[PDB]
Amino acid sequence: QLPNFTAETPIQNVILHEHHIFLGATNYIYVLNEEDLQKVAEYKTGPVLEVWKDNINMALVVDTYYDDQLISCGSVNRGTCQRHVFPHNHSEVHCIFSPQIEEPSQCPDCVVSALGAKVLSSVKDRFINFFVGNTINSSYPLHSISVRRLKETKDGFMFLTDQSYIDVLPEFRDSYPIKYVHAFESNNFIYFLTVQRETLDAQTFHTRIIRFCSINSGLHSYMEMPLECILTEVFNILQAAYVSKPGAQLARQIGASLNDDILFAVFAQSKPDSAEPMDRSAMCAFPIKYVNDFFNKIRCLQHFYGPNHEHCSGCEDEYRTEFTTALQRVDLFMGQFSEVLLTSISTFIKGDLTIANLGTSEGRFMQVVVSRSGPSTPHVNFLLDSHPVSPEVIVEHTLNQNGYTLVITGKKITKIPLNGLGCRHFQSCSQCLSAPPFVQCGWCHDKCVRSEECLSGTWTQQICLPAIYKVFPNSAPLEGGTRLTICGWDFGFRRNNKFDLKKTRVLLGNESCTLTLSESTMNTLKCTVGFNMSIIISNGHGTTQYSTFSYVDPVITSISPKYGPMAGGTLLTLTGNHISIGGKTCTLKSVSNSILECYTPAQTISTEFAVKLKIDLANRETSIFSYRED
Amino acid sequence: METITVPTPIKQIFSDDAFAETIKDNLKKKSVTDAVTQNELNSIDQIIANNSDIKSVQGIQYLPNVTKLFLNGNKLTDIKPLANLKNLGWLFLDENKVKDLSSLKDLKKLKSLSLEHNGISDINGLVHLPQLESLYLGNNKITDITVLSRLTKLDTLSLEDNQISDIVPLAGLTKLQNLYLSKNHISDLRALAGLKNLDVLELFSQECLNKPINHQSNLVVPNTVKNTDGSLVTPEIISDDGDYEKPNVKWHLPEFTNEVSFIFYQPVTIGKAKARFHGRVTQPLK
């Protein structure tokens, strides 16, 4: 239904340089068109020869500084990068690789690790620096963290110091690795969000932020710090993150300004003692300026230095440090996503609203209005495909705010607008007004449509009347207080965008009904009751009725067989309109409104007992059954 | 006591053009110029007139058997006509300007009342409705609320977006269940310590203030926020180099600022309800 594109293989990374998309996929780097997701050009890195190995892309970076050029980074040749000098207005490909006569002991051109890596580009001080985070296991050159700058010759990389890179020591090489989730630049500092051990050999896993101001070839203020997303219970594993500004509304609840960066991050409580995330996701925002206060508040790093040796001020050999006191926020969605696995996160602002669209381990995409107050229902919710959404996403802003996020699901990267899928895709009346202030819908009698697109004089943004489809059960006991499930449409009130069951009242005949609001939804009403009466439902604007509900009198005409096995195990049949004899409950075989079949409890008696129905009103103890030894 | 003995057109009964048409459509009539009988007026149980621009409901007195009223989104400023509607059950006058709520005094059959967005300052009139079961006083200017102490039947109760600073009065409302205290100036919470029947709660976005303090280079204002057990709720995000040294929030303020603040957060569970007490304490400076 919306602009789509699929490759030959899964897309690992996506970037956008001037009206042209770039999809770094397996063995390929496609060049799409910003307007219609139309594939224009492409480059086949293909299955390369180490043995034969797939060229899973690990990074895409473009810089028009020197000359306009893309730079891809494979995974087969020691994670080496290659240049892509653009044509002119749109082949031609070089390769980053010198030799190490400088000294073979290292490899500045071996940029990316094949076991996960994040790469950032910045033009710091006349040169194009590369900030590389590599997840490393036991194998022989490849820095876990590195500030290698590019040369003006554009055919290799070069560090500047012995300490322009931090490496996890060999004994910890494979033991407890570091999965690099995401990285970004802010306030002159560079950051890296990582999942890892809690400490050396510690069973359970973690999640930390990493900061360091860089000059020439940095790592001078390097410093890790724990990030914990809790709700009122830790969500260790980090799943994805995005950095934008706060909507004017969010800026009051978290104390952030409207131009301050915010670290939106979707977390996930992991399985017992593992780093494998469960389908239980949280999420919270971390004001980058606030993060830069925890750091400014006053234990040696285990993996750089020796765990058992002792060692280690104001920055706009200079060693690195860790933190004991974790920085933490609360789930902004109150854990609305307690039983779902969130994989992607993107954040934009339309007015005051701070909507952030999310992905799921099941391809579920949705735009949810972020706010501490109420966990607003996704005004956009659907499935892309059976392939979980990727954390890789692009957020593009156009004039008068049209916007779109490029979401990837395996091979298919789809172009979704921020303005929502119109008003046409809204199902019910209440849901038609639940859309944000900017959408401007208007339920029109039967269908939902835009403002001036109403065929009849029934277009409105407030008046939604109730409607009862069916109720369960259809009847009730004389005095009994049976539970009621009343399914229908539009039971919530309109305002602040959100709808609740505040002004929701149920009326059974004349007896006012009692609603357990927690268990009730915008479509499912659960009341507890206690004739051939009618049912009424008010949503603050109007009401509806339903005249099937009856208060029938449960009665047992006759019972057979009348005698039975002394032990007990005969089928007892009741007639009329939660059976248990002698106290100890019997069992129900076939229920009805006319006939009941039950298996008698093997009681340790030889006398007779009354048969008691307990349908919310303990009713007739009709004709007594007799246990007797034959 | 209001009984039209002679067949009279609907236009003459209800002086307000809008409300007259409403009754017209209700009675399947052709126009406001159609005559109607008292019998036809008696059989009117439920009027639905939200957003009808109705300015007055003069003539409603002749509808004794009316137990459902919907008048949200009108211009209503008077409710004297309703003063003697014997069997009025549900009433909704939101987004109006009804203020002389005393006009409901003798409506002892009224269950669910709604008066949000009415710019209501005082609410004391509600005392005369100990039978109320659903109060809705959100989006107003209510300050005191000691009146509610006697509405000991309310299983629901709004109050969001006012200036309620003291909520103690709600203490004995144990028959409550759905309470909504958002957007207020809720500092304390020890109050609702006994609502052991709650199910839904909304203690969100408080905006408390303290009396102005003389600003120094080293400032310390005591934490005021309290939880349901009376424990000093720990400040989530303080502002301007602020640290929380229990129980006092301290600041390092070299130059002069007009005020400091600290947004808080502290999810609470009362009875069976799970809500999250949130707000922003603020301190004037000079």
DSSP string spanning A363-406?
-EEEEEEE-SS-----SEEEE--SSPPPS-EEEE--TTS--EEE
- Write the single-letter amino acid at B227: N
- The answer to whether A351 touches A248, Cβ cutoff 8 Å, is yes
Q: What approach was used to elucidate this structure?
A: X-ray
Closest C-alpha to A80, from A42, A117, A129: A117
The span from the CA of B263 to the CA of B235, in Å, is 7
Which sign, positive or negative, has the C-alpha torsion A415, A416, A421, A426? positive
The span from the CA of A158 to the CA of A109, in Å, is 8
Would you call A463 and B51 a contact, using CB atoms and an 8 Å cutoff? Answer: yes
Would you call A517 and B134 a contact, using CB atoms and an 8 Å cutoff? Answer: no
CATH 3.40.50.970 fits A420-464, yes or no: no
- The answer to whether A347 touches A353, Cβ cutoff 8 Å, is no
Tokens of B40: 């036809």
Fold (CATH) for A465-551 = Immunoglobulin-like (2.60.40)
Would you call A232 and B68 a contact, using CB atoms and an 8 Å cutoff? Answer: no
List every span in chain A annotated with CATH 2.60.40.10: 465-551, 552-630
Q: What is the CATH number of domain B1-211?
A: 3.80.10.10
- The answer to whether A375 touches A500, Cβ cutoff 8 Å, is no
CATH 1.10.1060.10 fits A552-630, yes or no: no
The span from the CA of B114 to the CA of B158, in Å, is 9
CATH 2.130.10.10 fits A1-419, yes or no: yes
Nearest to B48 among A231, A252, A542 (CB): A542
Nearest to B199 among A372, A518, A542 (CB): A518
List every span in chain A annotated with CATH 3.30.1680.10: 420-464
| Widest Cα–Cα separation across chain B | 82
Give how far Cα B168 sits from Cα of B48, B149, B228, B272, B275, Å: 37, 9, 12, 20, 18
- Write the single-letter amino acid at A312: C
The span from the CA of A227 to the CA of A235, in Å, is 10
- Say how many CB pairs under 8 Å bridge A and B: 78
The span from the CA of A467 to the CA of A486, in Å, is 10
Residue A17, Cβ neighbours under 10 Å: how many?
17
* Chain B residues 189-218 within an 8 A CB cutoff of chain A: 199-200, 204-205
- The answer to whether A270 touches A278, Cβ cutoff 8 Å, is yes
Residues 6+ apart with CB under 8 A from A201: A175, A176
Resolution in A: 4.0
- The answer to whether A486 touches A537, Cβ cutoff 8 Å, is yes
The span from the CA of A342 to the CA of A384, in Å, is 14
DSSP state of A554: -
Domain-by-domain residue ranges, chain B?
1-211, 212-286
Comparing alpha-carbon positions, the chain A residue that sits nearest to B204 is: A373
Tokens of A450: 């835009």
The span from the CA of B120 to the CA of B122, in Å, is 6
3-state secondary structure B182-200: CCCCCCCCHHHHHCCCCCE
List every span in chain A annotated with CATH 2.130.10.10: 1-419
DSSP state of A289: H
Q: Please report residues of B whose CB lies closer than 8 A to that of A290.
A: 237
Would you call B136 and A502 a contact, using CB atoms and an 8 Å cutoff? Answer: yes
- The answer to whether B265 touches B236, Cβ cutoff 8 Å, is yes
Residues of chain A contacting B, Cβ within 8 Å: 231-232, 252-255, 287, 290, 293, 329-330, 334, 372-373, 460, 462-463, 502-503, 505, 512, 514, 516-518, 538, 540-543
The span from the CA of B98 to the CA of B104, in Å, is 11
Domain B212-286, CATH number (from 3.40.50.300, 3.30.300.30, 3.40.720.10, 2.60.40.1220): 2.60.40.1220
Give how far Cα A22 sits from Cα of A42, A57, A179, A417, Å: 9, 12, 25, 19
